[PDB]
């Protein structure tokens, strides 16, 4: 077929995982002695592909008769090495993180969607103020807690863990 259009759109975590051939779990590049890629690191042939055409990492499969075969000893597909330019990997985050393009490109798309000013989105995103998702009937300073309210750390602790003090 002939290319006629080029679309660009946001990618879902499921889409990003669909691209990925493996999760990069170790911050390691190559071995200081073998000068071969480390397992589950940024250059792993198990994830991104063979370094030599139609040859797995250990050496059990080394010709084109095996094509698409995944070696059982080392786990590297036998294809062309060109694929190390194309196969994405991914990192699974413990906490979600905001894509800075949609935060710092004013007017912020996130902060516009949620009616959150640049200062408020900054304070929540870089852990300077809490934001309420459910007040569970909380009351602060004589007014009840409305959703999407910006509580400082002192206020959040006074609400969530109560007031107290110690005197010497």
């Amino acid at each position: 077929k002939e290319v006629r259009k080029v679309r660009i759109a946001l990618a879902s975590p499921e889409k990003i995982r669909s691209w990925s051939y493996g999760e990069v779990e170790k911050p390691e590049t190559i071995n200081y002695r073998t000068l071969k890629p480390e397992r589950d690191g940024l250059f792993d042939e198990r994830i991104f592909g063979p370094i030599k055409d139609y040859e797995c990492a250990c050496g059990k499969y080394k010709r084109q008769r095996f094509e698409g075969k995944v070696c059982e000893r080392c786990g590297v597909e036998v294809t062309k090495s060109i694929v190390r330019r194309y196969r994405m990997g991914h990192i699974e985050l413990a906490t979600p993180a905001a894509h800075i393009w949609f935060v710092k490109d004013v007017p912020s798309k996130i902060g516009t969607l949620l009616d959150l000013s640049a200062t408020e989105l900054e304070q929540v995103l870089y852990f300077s103020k809490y934001i309420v998702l459910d007040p569970k009937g909380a009351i602060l300073n004589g007014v009840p807690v409305e959703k999407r309210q910006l509580l400082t750390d002192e206020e959040y602790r006074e609400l969530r863990y109560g007031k107290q003090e110690t005197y010497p």
């Binding site: 994405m88 413990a94 993180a97 710092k104 929540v124 459910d134 863990y161």
Partner: protein
């Protein structure tokens, strides 16, 4: 600021539990809860103390923001903003137009707003950020590898601090550092100080820098070569 409730028999709630008015504290249900708060079982004093506090859900960071963005019903907001577009004040009409533009972009495109928050971070193919032996046996490498390494170290330490039940100050620090790691990977220099390699003032070259500028991908290798 707490509420005392002595007890004489087997107590039914342990330390740390969240209590609401009308909850059974001890003695098979005889002594119960008055105020909202948190349970401090004092066995020395034989009293079940309750310090007044609500069970309020208040988060920080992209987890909170992602929740809120998931919670957006787009058509409802479009309706509210259309109603706002009939307002006399020109500023309110302007703001509702600027918001409704984003809303309708997401609606007509089919993109979920929450997708502006990353759970899985993609990793570029290794040949596009090579680790090559230069003539003579030494190694040259792209900056993206050090940015990804920062990211993966901080993410792994976060997973371990979670699995090991760390306090809140520490998890908060780790999460802040993780957001900034991602930010440096994607648009280093944009927010805050730019990440540099040790012993050099040079900013590392992130993905945005690869795309744009005089030396960016478009002008340097796509519109001319």
């Amino acid at each position: 600021k707490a509420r005392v409730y002595p007890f004489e028999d087997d107590v039914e709630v342990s330390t740390g539990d969240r209590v609401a008015p009308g909850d059974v504290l001890a003695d098979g249900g005889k002594v119960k809860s008055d105020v909202y708060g948190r349970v401090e079982v004092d066995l020395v004093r034989n009293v079940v103390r309750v310090v007044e506090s609500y069970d309020i859900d208040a988060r920080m960071g992209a987890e909170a923001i992602q929740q809120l963005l998931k919670e957006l019903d787009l058509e409802a907001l479009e309706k509210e903003l259309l109603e706002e577009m009939k307002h006399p004040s020109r500023a309110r009409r302007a703001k509702a137009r600027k918001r409704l533009e984003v809303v309708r972009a997401f609606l007509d495109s089919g993109n979920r707003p929450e997708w502006m928050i990353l759970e899985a971070v993609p990793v570029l193919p290794p040949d596009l950020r090579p680790m090559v032996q230069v003539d003579g046996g030494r190694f040259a490498t792209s900056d993206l590898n050090d940015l990804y390494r920062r990211l993966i170290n901080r993410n792994n330490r976060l997973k371990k601090l979670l699995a090991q039940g760390a306090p809140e100050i520490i998890i908060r620090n780790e999460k802040r550092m993780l957001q900034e790691a991602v930010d440096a990977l994607l648009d280093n220099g944009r927010r805050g100080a730019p990440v540099t390699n040790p012993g050099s003032d040079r900013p590392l070259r992130s993905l945005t820098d690869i795309l744009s500028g005089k030396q960016g991908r478009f002008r340097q290798n796509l519109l001319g070569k």
